[PDB]
């Protein structure tokens, strides 16, 4: 059994016939999918998933007939005391294996030194880590056009100013039409486009010509460095960063930052010195659905959120509205737990061995990770 998770598995309810619509790959392979059990939210369902297919390959090495239960709960388990009995109970998939409710250990959960004492697990099917859900902001920063990439006050101010000086050297002409052609002279100067009538004969008014010229070159400069600046820089603050990040490090009502309810990730937040106020607060506001995490990002409800990092990296493909966090935290990966021992124990050991040996993992990237258009 396992729970539907995009990085783990994508399985909707099956067809009306209880079938899967045949879909080949981007490589054009109608990759195998299976039936499953499913919850109303005890019903049948379909088994379709990348790592699910990894299990398929596992049985494909040493034969065992895959019977995929659904996951009664969302998580695997964490030994936790009940309202009585003084017994720390891991309630879930992990518990189900402790309950022996099924045979195979199927889930891309991290190796939990917590869950370690409960039972052994396998070596990593993949490398992974922890980080906080990062949600992109409005990219924006397109502005000013040509016009506003000038000071309308100053822009037209200097334009009509050039008209004024045009009247000035125009008086230099009338003193000692050339006035209208002069309008072409200063205005054209603004364009620097060479209207072509001519330039005045007055060396004084000519030097004034060099002046308005300098005005122009400076103006071309104005547009230049202007749009440069518009093009230049970037958004002032993306933030997050350090696992100690001040927003996280600063308990208050403003920043909303949390993670899943009853999570191996939450386990990474479980026993620690520093997490105190964090683990406290988040636990109060925590949400229980990684689905509600993705949508939550789409919802932009919380200022921040956290979940399985590399997972989110897969989710990073799921939409452009989100962001990628900085780096790893409490890094483990994916694998298969070990309940006591089975022939499947050292068997599956060999499984992983050929796995990293073979390229079917890279195929999983194709099946999953290679799909990034991000």
């Amino acid at each position: 059994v396992t729970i539907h998770q995009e990085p783990f598995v994508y399985v909707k309810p099956t067809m009306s016939d209880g079938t899967c619509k045949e879909e080949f790959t981007v490589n054009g392979d109608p990759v195998k999918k299976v039936i499953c059990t499913g919850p109303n939210d005890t019903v049948p369902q379909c088994c379709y998933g990348f790592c699910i297919d990894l299990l398929i390959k596992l049985a494909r090495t040493m034969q065992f007939t895959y019977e995929v239960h659904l996951v009664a709960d969302g998580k695997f388990g964490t030994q936790e005391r009940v309202q009585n009995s003084n017994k720390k109970e891991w309630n879930g998939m992990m518990g189900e294996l402790l309950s022996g409710q099924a045979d195979m250990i199927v889930a891309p959960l991290t190796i939990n030194n917590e869950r370690a004492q409960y039972i052994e697990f396998s070596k990593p099917f993949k490398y992974q880590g922890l980080t906080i859900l990062v949600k992109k902001e409005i990219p924006r920063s397109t502005l000013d056009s040509f016009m506003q990439p000038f000071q309308s006050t100053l822009w037209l101010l200097v334009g009509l100013s050039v008209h004024v000086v045009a009247v000035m050297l125009y008086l230099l002409d009338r003193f000692s039409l050339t006035l209208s052609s002069a309008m072409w002279f200063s205005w054209g100067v603004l364009l620097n486009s060479g209207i072509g009538e001519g330039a005045p004969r007055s060396f004084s008014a000519r030097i004034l010509g060099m002046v308005w010229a300098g005005f122009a070159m400076i103006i071309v400069a104005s547009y230049t460095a202007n749009l440069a600046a518009f093009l230049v820089l970037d958004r002032p603050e993306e933030r997050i960063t350090g696992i100690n990040d001040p927003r996280l490090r600063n308990p208050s009502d403003k920043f909303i930052y949390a993670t899943v309810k009853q999570s191996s990730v939450d386990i990474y937040f479980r026993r620690q010195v520093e997490l105190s106020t964090m683990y406290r607060h988040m636990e109060k506001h925590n949400y229980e659905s990684a689905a509600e995490a993705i949508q939550a990002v789409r919802d932009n409800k919380l200022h921040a959120f956290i979940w399985d990092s590399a997972v989110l990296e897969f989710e990073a493909s799921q939409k452009c509205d989100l962001v990628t966090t900085g780096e790893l935290f409490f890094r483990s990966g994916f694998g298969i737990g070990m309940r006591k021992d089975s022939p499947w124990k050292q068997q599956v050991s060999l499984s992983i061995l050929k796995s990293h040996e073979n390229g079917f993992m890279e195929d999983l990237d194709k099946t999953w990770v290679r799909y990034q258009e991000c």
Binding site: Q151, G194, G198, F215, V232, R249, K254
Partner: protein
């Protein structure tokens, strides 16, 4: 510096490193804060049992009756061996009580909001460029003359001045094209010359564009902006709340402001900080340490401490005690090894580590400096007007 909270409603208590304190019939309230914890580890190595209380009067101390309004008076009250909170090192305090070197330095400061640039026009130009321009006139008229020799509307070197000097700014003067073939080659020289030149213009504009030194803040307790509140059109409100320690500093430092500052005086550190968020006043003077404290916490990018943080009335904070106390040399040594720990880095962590980052940019489309360019322009214009009447004399 400090933090407090309500106790955990379910447990009615505080977990992790949080400490209790009663508040009045004194009911508990959560004792927290980093420098608090500095006192924690302090007493730890010191092995002295701490006890917490809620100050019921003022903040630190005063006279105004000729007696302290705050925890100072508690030392006069001798209700504790020593007590915590940011300790203003003050002659009054110095007189009053006993304190060693601070846990952290402090000072006098104000904080502007970030600026909501009169250089570029001439800035990158590298005025020796203009020298090369005079030279361009030199060799320009030179080739004008000598080229015309074998060549000899003539378009004399005044016209040619308007020509090559046409190229001087982006060409763009259509009139009077000299047809000299070799002369045209010279036009190529000044031409691609002008190409690289206009390039220098452009990338120069990139540089000044890439160039950001904003700054432009007040001097300090010596600020001319602080010298004459009526000098500029608007008065620049800078100050803090009443009964301030660094205010009493200013009370000694400069009186005229302290008077004038009384007009715009506001209530509360974080409250008037929000007044800065609204900028209802110009800026807010406060304790430097407390200031940067006000820096790290910010909604968006808004405030700017007055200046880069240059020291104004350097000071510190700590836990004072009464004169001739027992832990005196001890608690001193406590402080000594405490800095000896290096965990003050972790004091940045628990507290002083900021997200405001440091040092460095919106769009300046306005005139300002550009109006300075227009300035130099019209200036030269009228210059040609006067010299023009002088030519009427000529």
């Amino acid at each position: 510096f400090v933090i407090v909270e309500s106790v955990d409603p379910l447990s009615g208590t505080c977990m992790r490193n949080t400490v209790p304190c009663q508040k009045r019939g004194y009911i508990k309230k959560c004792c927290k804060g980093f420098c608090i914890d500095i006192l924690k580890k302090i007493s730890k190595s010191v092995k002295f049992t701490y006890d917490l209380y809620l100050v019921t009067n003022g903040k630190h101390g005063k006279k105004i009756n000729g007696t302290w309004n705050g925890m100072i008076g508690e030392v006069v009250m001798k209700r504790a061996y020593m007590a915590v909170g940011s300790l203003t090192i003050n002659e009054e305090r110095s007189e009053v009580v006993d304190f060693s070197v601070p846990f952290i330095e402090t000072g006098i400061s104000v904080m502007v909001s970030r600026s909501n640039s009169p250089s570029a026009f001439l800035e990158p130009f590298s005025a020796c460029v203009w020298v090369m321009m005079f030279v361009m006139l030199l060799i320009v008229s030179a080739v004008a003359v000598f080229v015309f020799e074998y060549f000899s509307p003539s378009f004399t070197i005044g016209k040619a001045i308007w020509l090559l000097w046409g190229l001087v700014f982006n060409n763009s003067v259509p009139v009077q094209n000299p047809k000299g073939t070799t002369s045209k080659i010279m036009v190529s020289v000044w031409a691609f010359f002008a190409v690289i030149f206009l390039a220098s213009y452009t990338a120069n504009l990139a540089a000044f564009m890439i160039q950001e030194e904003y700054v432009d803040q007040v001097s300090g307790l010596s600020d001319k902006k602080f010298q004459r509140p009526n000098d500029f059109s608007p008065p620049f409100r800078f100050g803090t709340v009443p009964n301030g320690s660094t205010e009493r500093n200013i009370r000694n430092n400069y009186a005229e402001m302290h008077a004038y500052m009384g007009k715009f005086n506001q209530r509360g550190v974080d409250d008037a900080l929000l007044s800065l968020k609204t900028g209802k006043l110009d800026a807010f003077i406060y304790d430097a340490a407390v200031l940067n404290y006000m820096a790290g916490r910010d909604e968006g990018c808004k405030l700017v401490t007055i200046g880069s943080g240059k020291v104004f009335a350097s000071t510190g904070y700590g836990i004072a005690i009464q004169k001739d106390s027992g832990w005196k040399r001890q608690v001193d040594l406590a402080i000594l090894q405490l800095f000896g720990d290096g965990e003050m880095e972790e004091l940045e962590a628990l507290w002083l580590t900021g997200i405001c980052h440091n040092e460095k940019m919106s769009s300046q489309l306005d005139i300002d400096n550009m109006a300075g360019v227009f300035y130099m322009l019209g200036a030269a214009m009228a210059l040609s007007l006067i010299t023009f009447i002088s030519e009427h004399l000529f």
